[PDB]
Design a protein around this nucleic acid. Structure first.
Ligand SMILES: Nc1ncnc2c1ncn2[C@@H]1O[C@H](COP(=O)(O)OP(=O)(O)OP(O)(O)=S)[C@@H](O)[C@H]1O
Ligand SMILES: [Mg+2]
Lengths: 333, 56
DNA sequence: TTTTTTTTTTTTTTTTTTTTTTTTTTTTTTTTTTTTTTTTTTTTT
DNA sequence: TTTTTTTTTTTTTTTTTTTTTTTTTTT
């Protein structure tokens, strides 16, 4: 009896809100399809597993940070390359003024369709991000270094002049404005960030990031990337051994890690991962420094085993399919 | 709000004194902006109450 | 020493201002969290 | 005895509101 009057009161209120603010202003969460998490590839299969939901989420903010020459720019160009191959439009805001387009082409980016901007101030850079979000016509935006997003007052002023908390205040305003617009447009925003040291503390980590605290709250994924070794062909150093750690995750469990090789000129070594996942899931047999697939010996050492998976695409297609079925917790075929 | 307070002070002051009634207002604090001199702390609801109060 | 004892509107404009220079009169908080780091292996000469 | 006639003119102010944000090693 009392339930009936409350159902009517609710229906009326829901009606009034939808009138005043538009059709999709308030819905039941179960019947709202805009609220579903869609993901795109990172270029690394081991990273797609570590993220849990199969890749980076569309309509959200992501942060990648680490020390110098750790592979941050290379990793974001592999994301752009994978998205372009699925017919998506991509932008690159280069605030560091250090992007090489010949290297971008070698990693597999379509240079001719990549929108690029080299802005003068931090405010100009974040106003272009807001404009491209609202447009609805861009899928992936990369902002290379938060650290190089200098406010207007600091560029007009002279070296030595104190502008304490000015960059932090700009980033807090940018997050507030960008978050709503990115979600409506279904646009992925990636921020690259540098490491700085915090002075006069012994408890906890002395490592921090530039640009204040807002970005830590608003980011749906935060990745810590680090160079953990060299890749050699006898003497010649040909690439880097890399570890990515998922330090924050809001679409799946955090604190999982990924290990892969970045080869200079080629980018991320896909077949290198496929061996390591094949060994892990008992689809490839290992006898010391010898690799074997279904009895027959594929090679000796990881490099020869990887070179075997290159010139046998049938076995490479087969193993990829089974690893994808098994380990990916939410496959999207 | 200030104009409502200014009007209530005029109406009340005479009636409280005639009845011999004590009226206590609680107020909250709020920050002023564009203030280099003195305290940036203000109170809420205008200026009338600072004039009409016997004790603050 | 009077009585009326019932009324109407019926649609408007202004024709562009100054101010003529601000105050203040010295406050507070009232005691936090950290939550655990990396490095990736140098050079001598 | 005998019978009405016709509008006029403006006055005067009242009251505040509310904070934002870190930055960087030294032998
Ligand atoms: N044009 C290039 N040709 C060959 N190797 C390159 C080139 N650019 C970068 N690399 C290498 O790829 C590895 C990762 O480089 P990046 O992706 O630039 O890492 P990063 O963290 O962006 O470095 P920064 O911006 O300089 S702090 C490094 O060992 C580089 O030397
Ligand atoms: Mg870079």
């Amino acid at each position: 009896a009392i339930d009936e009057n409350k159902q009517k009161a609710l229906a009326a209120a829901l009606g009034q809100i939808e009138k005043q603010f538009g059709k999709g202003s308030i819905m039941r969460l179960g019947e709202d399809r805009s609220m579903d998490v869609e993901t795109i590839s990172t270029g690394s299969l081991s990273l797609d597993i570590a993220l849990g939901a199969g890749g980076l989420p569309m309509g959200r903010i992501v942060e990648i940070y680490g020390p110098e020459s750790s592979g941050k720019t290379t990793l974001t160009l592999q994301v752009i390359a994978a998205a372009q191959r699925e017919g998506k439009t991509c932008a690159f805001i280069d605030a560091e003024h250090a992007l090489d387009p010949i290297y971008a082409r070698k990693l597999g980016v379509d240079i001719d369709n990549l929108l690029c901007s080299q802005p003068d101030t931090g405010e100009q850079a974040l106003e272009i991000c807001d404009a491209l979000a609202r447009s609805g016509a861009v899928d992936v935006i990369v902002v290379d270094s938060v650290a190089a997003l200098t406010p207007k007052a600091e560029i007009e002023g002279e070296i030595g002049d104190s502008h304490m908390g000015l960059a932090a205040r700009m980033m807090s305003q940018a997050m507030r404005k960008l978050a709503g617009n990115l979600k409506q447009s279904n646009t992925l925003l990636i921020f690259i960030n540098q490491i700085r040291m915090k002075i006069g503390v012994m408890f906890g980590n002395p490592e921090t990031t530039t640009g204040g605290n807002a970005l830590k709250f608003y980011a749906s994924v935060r990745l810590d990337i680090r160079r953990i070794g060299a890749v050699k062909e006898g003497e010649n150093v040909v690439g880097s051994e890399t570890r990515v750690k998922v330090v924050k995750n809001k679409i799946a469990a955090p604190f999982k890690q990924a290990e892969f090789q970045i080869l200079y000129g080629e980018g991320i070594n896909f077949y290198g991962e496929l061996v390591d996942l094949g060994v892990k899931e008992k689809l490839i047999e290992k006898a010391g420094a010898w690799y074997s697939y279904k009895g027959e010996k594929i090679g000796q050492g990881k490099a020869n085993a990887t070179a075997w998976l290159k010139d046998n695409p049938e076995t490479a297609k087969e193993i990829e399919k089974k690893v994808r079925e098994l380990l990916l917790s939410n496959p999207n075929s």
